[PDB]
Design a protein around this ligand. Structure first.
Ligand SMILES: C[C@@H]1[C@@H](O)CCCN1Cc1ccccc1
Ligand SMILES: C[C@@H]1[C@@H](O)CCCN1Cc1ccccc1
Lengths: 304, 304
């Protein structure tokens, strides 16, 4: 019993973290096979960062300008190219600790673990969701850029996120491992305002199921609702719409608990309308939205 | 910027997790050098668990009854002894992945990462506090026993916790790595009631400092208080007393923020007396007590 905000074990990713230095800028790189992936803004002075021209900045750069360090051993860079907003540094050594891996572009509301690193060294791991506005609410100081977000399926690391920016509002933006930004963000120190930070409705319902499974049931009410009725209320409260796809995804939790998805929706509706009245659910005083249905099943079934 | 419930990177501990099987019971063991540490209740049938006599159960056991598996390779057990509530299985192979390590018995209110495992395989990592009543609020299903709690100081893993029991109230009890229970608990399926689950006051204040550092300041008030006055209020609200030692420990956060510890105490007092009035602090609707002063400094300074 018990439900925790649980990150994937980080060992397989720890083994891929290196230090990349271009001139006076040091940040983190991901070493997979004989390629080190890092944010292209490694080539910028924070002066550059106001209106950087990456193609022009890169003309001045050679393989030997990219200093790549894995522990206390230097990697020889034998090529470099820019793909979108990441640099791919070809090194002469395949990472011997390369796990089975994929690059995946996640959807908003999907969850992943971040291994926060500084100078190619892991400092901690935490579990995130991609917000519906394609930001994440991370913990990232200067030097953390190139820290990555991942999921693990048994022995396969799916890399979904590389950290690039802190918006002026202290929320975080980055790319998939093809270097394409999540959301409308760019690697420039400019006016970038995130959209509405809405709640991931399907995740809240998953977590309400997790609560019922773990014995927290005070919020279960006598009511049901419809998708349209529930969605009217969701909208008022800056909750993302619930689709039939979300209902289908919650099916197994519905099955396990014997609480129909629309009944759990009616319970959530009353929590929105009436608040918690000072009570807690799984030790939280607000409605948690950083567990997917998949996460709740995984943790409630003990997948390794 | 940003503040997250961050676990230590788990790789060094992942490399120490094995599967221990005695008869039909499988749980997790910790392989350090040529010793595998596991809960002694591995020798019990859940029948035994009502009033087990470990010394008598162990007489019937031989080295070859303890099946130890590290990945898909079997370890040869060449000795076994009971130390308090843990078994030490001597194997013929030193774990080649043994990190530098210590065994430490933590105090209540201290924080640590748990690597939740099943059949010697990591499933996730989360950050805990030892509650003042010496329970932890974990996420542990059957097969998770022998999962461990640790801190990392640069390259040295300090192991502080091994998971043994779920109390009938769904909270968790375990031992240090010398096999001595935290709190008054025993490895028996009996009436064991935890004491008052109080809040770790010093940790709340640390986390209020973390909030100020990260821009959440709405709760800062115009008031100060005294230790005695604050402690009267703490007591009423099931908060542990604040000592001069706690004030001294908060000194660096006091210094960094320019908010005297007793002023932050007056802010906490008003939060206790008046509640959050529906507001949040670092995305929480309650007062978080699972960050130590050390944790706040570590994460706010980016230690690896
Ligand atoms: C624009 C936002 C954004 O966060 C992501 C995409 C959808 N959202 C729409 C939305 C707005 C207000 C209430 C509910 C839903
Ligand atoms: C007995 C508890 C226990 O949780 C740990 C040790 C100290 N506590 C005392 C306490 C009780 C009530 C309010 C405040 C403090």
């Amino acid at each position: 019993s018990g439900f925790r905000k649980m990150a994937f074990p980080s060992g397989k990713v720890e083994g891929c973290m290196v230090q990349v230095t271009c001139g006076t800028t040091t940040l983190n790189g991901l070493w997979l096979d004989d390629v080190v992936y890092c944010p292209r803004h490694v080539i910028c002075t924070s002066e550059d960062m106001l209106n950087p021209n990456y193609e022009d900045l890169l003309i001045r750069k050679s393989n030997h300008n990219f200093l790549v360090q894995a522990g206390n051993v230097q990697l020889r860079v034998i090529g470099h190219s820019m793909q979108n907003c990441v640099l791919k540094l070809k090194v002469d050594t395949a990472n011997p600790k390369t796990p089975k891996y994929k690059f995946v572009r996640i959807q908003p509301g999907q969850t992943f673990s971040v291994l926060a690193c500084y100078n190619g060294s892991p400092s901690g791991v935490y579990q995130c969701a991609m917000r519906p506005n394609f930001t994440i609410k991370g913990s990232f100081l200067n030097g953390s850029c190139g820290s990555v977000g991942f999921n693990i399926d048994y022995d396969c690391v799916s890399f979904c996120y590389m950290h690039h920016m802190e918006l002026p509002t202290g929320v975080h933006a980055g790319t998939d491992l093809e270097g394409n930004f999540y959301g409308p963000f760019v690697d420039r120190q400019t006016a970038q305002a995130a959209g509405t930070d809405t709640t991931i409705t399907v995740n809240v319902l998953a977590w309400l199921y997790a609560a019922v499974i773990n014995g927290d049931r005070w919020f279960l009410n006598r009511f049901t609702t419809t998708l349209n009725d529930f969605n009217l209320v969701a909208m008022k409260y800056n909750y993302e719409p619930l689709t039939q796809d979300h209902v289908d995804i919650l099916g197994p939790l519905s099955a396990q608990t014997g609480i129909a998805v629309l009944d759990m929706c009616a319970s959530l509706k009353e929590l929105l309308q009436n608040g918690m009245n000072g009570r807690t659910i799984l030790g939280s005083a607000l409605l948690e939205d950083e567990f997917t249905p998949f996460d709740v099943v995984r943790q409630c079934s003990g997948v390794t």
